[PDB]
Symmetry: none
Subunit: 76 residues, 6 copies
């Protein structure tokens, strides 16, 4: 019973993005107000909490192409 | 029972980004107010908390291409 | 039972980013106010907390391409 | 023609206010945003302008009784 | 023609205010944003302008009673 | 023509304010942002301008009673 696995992917890809000019981006928030009123937290595993986070972002890349992959062979 | 694994991926890829000019980005937040009122925290594992984080970001890269990958062979 | 593993990935990739000029980035926050009111913390493992962090960032790289990878062979 | 004026008002008044206790007043605005876009102003007399005034007030007096009066004899 | 004026007001008044206790007043604004964009101003007389005034007030007097009066005899 | 003026006001008044205790006043603004963009000002008389004044006040007197008066006899 010669188990045999020849796992062999190939990949010849491209993720291009040609752009002319990024200009005149304004972003002027106006404050606000948050108020959490809790008692206890008991986080236990892989928790990713964000309690009462008033914030702003301006993510303006000239690129932004993401090519995520994943492989796995859970042999038993 | 000669178990055999020939795990062998290939990758010939490209993630390019041609851009002209990044200009005139303004980002003028206006404050705000946060207020958390908790009692106890009992974080226990891999916790990633952000309690009451008033903040701002301006992430303006000339690139930004991300190529994440992952492999695994959990043999038993 | 001559177990055999020939784990052998290849990688011929590129993550390029051609840009013209990064210019005229302004970032003028306006303060704010935070107030946490807790009693006890009992962090225990791999905790990554940020309690009441009022802050700002201006991350403006001429690059920014990230190529993360990971491999693993948990043989038993 | 002995013109005669015997202008003579009297006033025996009271403006009282008995109160027990002023307590637990909260006032938590949430920001906002204004934007005026004008060209010219040409104010000329007794003008009382307030252009684009984002503001807040908390006027909590233990009194507040106002007794305004006015007299006049424009004789000719 | 013996013109005669006997202008003679009297005033026996009171503006009282009895109060118990002023307590627990909170006032927590949350910022905001204003933007005026004008060209010329040409104020000329008794002008009282307030252009783009973002502000806050907390006027909490234990009194506050105002008794304004005015008299005049513009004889000709 | 013996013009005669017997201008003679009287005033027996009181503006009292009895209070118990002023306590626990909080006032926690949260910033903001103003921006005026003008070219010329040409103020000429008795002008009282306040251009772009971001500010705060906490006027907490134990009194505050104001008794303003005015008299005038513009004889001709």
């Amino acid at each position: 019973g010669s188990v045999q696995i020849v796992y062999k992917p190939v990949d010849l890809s491209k993720v291009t993005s040609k752009c002319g000019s990024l200009g005149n981006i304004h972003h002027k928030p106006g404050g606000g107000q948050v108020e959490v009123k809790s008692e206890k937290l008991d986080f236990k595993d892989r928790v990713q909490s964000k309690i009462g986070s008033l914030d702003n972002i301006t993510h303006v890349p000239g690129g932004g192409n993401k090519k995520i992959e994943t492989h796995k062979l859970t042999f038993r």
